[PDB]
């Protein structure tokens, strides 16, 4: 019911403002809290009554409300800050607590390693069983954000596509996978298939054919 933009960016030492838009029945009329979702943890309270810090939180954090909107300033950006930030208040039309959808703030203190991509064709075993899977393995990329396009010769494919969300690796770089399901006949009828991976606006595209090795 509250709108906050989805993502934010900076290098350690800089500063941002996450904005929270709502209405009359909530922000125009009620107080706003700010909660930090450290990845893979339950969220923690940062700010109530629009700007009231909680203990041990540094003054780097600042909140502010004006009529129908609110905003979380964060300065002197640090690693271990990067996480999901949600605004929250009470809406007096529906009689509930509401949150924003969240904003993911990544702190880029590591270099833009584009992804290493390995693409495998369908196995003998699988084709023998009347099935076909193409496997696209994406690794050692930074930051942890990518977008995937499969293409049968020159035509785009979105049907039978399963893509994982990026994950962190041993080295604090990221790894993802994408799977294309075909009939054996679709696999054998096309000259080639290609997984096209785009990272920070730049593409990597690996290609396989039914002709062996």
């Amino acid at each position: 019911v509250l709108t906050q933009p989805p993502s934010v960016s900076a290098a350690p030492g800089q500063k941002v403002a996450v904005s929270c838009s709502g209405s009359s029945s909530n922000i125009g009329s009620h107080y706003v809290s700010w909660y930090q979702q450290l990845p893979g943890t339950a969220p923690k309270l940062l700010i109530y009554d629009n700007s009231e810090r909680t203990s041990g939180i540094p003054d780097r954090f600042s909140g502010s409300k004006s009529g129908t909107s609110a905003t979380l300033g964060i300065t002197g950006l640090q690693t271990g800050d990067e996480a999901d930030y949600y605004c929250g208040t009470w809406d007096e039309l529906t009689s509930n607590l509401v949150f924003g959808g969240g904003t993911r703030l990544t702190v880029l203190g590591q270099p833009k390693a584009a992804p290493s991509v390995t693409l495998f064709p369908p196995s003998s075993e699988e084709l023998q069983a009347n099935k076909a899977t193409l496997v696209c393995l994406i690794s050692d990329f930074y930051p942890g954000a990518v977008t995937v396009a499969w293409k049968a010769d020159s035509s785009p494919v979105k049907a039978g596509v399963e893509t994982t969300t990026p994950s962190k690796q041993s080295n604090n770089k990221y790894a993802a996978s994408s799977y294309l399901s075909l009939t054996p006949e679709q696999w054998k009828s096309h000259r080639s298939y290609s997984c096209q991976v785009t990272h920070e606006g730049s593409t990597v595209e690996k290609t396989v054919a039914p002709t062996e090795c």
Binding site: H30, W90, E92, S95, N96
Partner: protein, 316 residues
Amino acid sequence: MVHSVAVIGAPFSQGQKRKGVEHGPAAIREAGLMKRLSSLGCHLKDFGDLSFTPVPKDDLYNNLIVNPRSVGLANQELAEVVSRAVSDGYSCVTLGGDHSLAIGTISGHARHCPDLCVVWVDAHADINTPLTTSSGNLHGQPVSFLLRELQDKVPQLPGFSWIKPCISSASIVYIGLRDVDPPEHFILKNYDIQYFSMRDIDRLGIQKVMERTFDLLIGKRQRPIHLSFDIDAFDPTLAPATGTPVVGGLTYREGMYIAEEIHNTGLLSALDLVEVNPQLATSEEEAKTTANLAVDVIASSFGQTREGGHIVYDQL
């Protein structure tokens, strides 16, 4: 008409940080209140805890943050329950949340006892007017709806048009003040309300205080007595579990003395014990010890003593 004893729970507050005050009656009930009173040979009648439901929106948020109209209107229901209880010949004990309930219990009493007087034991004077403190202070603001000289400076909040000022400035004595706003300070002075601040107790003594107090209340005629004891009157080391703990307050000894004295007039008609808030305690010990103190006050006011009582003609 103080022949027996009525116990009435009134868990009222405005919410916000001081919302654990609504849990006070249970805490005192859980300090073994009724045993004591029963074992002080009193015929007791337990009238239970009152419904406290906000007006006119009983959704979640209002429960956490209550509006003034909701309190004023829960006091009306209280004055009625106090009134009937007096009418049937009982002494009223009202276990409280915030000191605002005093509005409903004094209004109730006044009704069947219009010559009553008041001893307000408290660190505060709770005598701000609606235009002198914030929306939030209604607990620290209830005496300007009862006093009859303040109505020129007191506006008609909805929920409060039933309140009919049932005390003159010369019928209330304060014991134990140490935290008084300038607005309050001027009122005390300007309308010649007598009071004994922690300074006057350092000087005079709790003995001479009570002496001077009774002379000013019941000195030339017997009246029914309304003890509105606020728990933050006791020094915070004795009573830690409360919303506005102010340092330098009554010792245990001073507080029982006051109770002991009120009982000894045998004129006590109704008693309020308020601002007991267990959410604010450092431990269960602290919550428990505060309510234990609150059970002693009442017990004393109703005949408990530190040197014996009761009946015996012992065997061999």
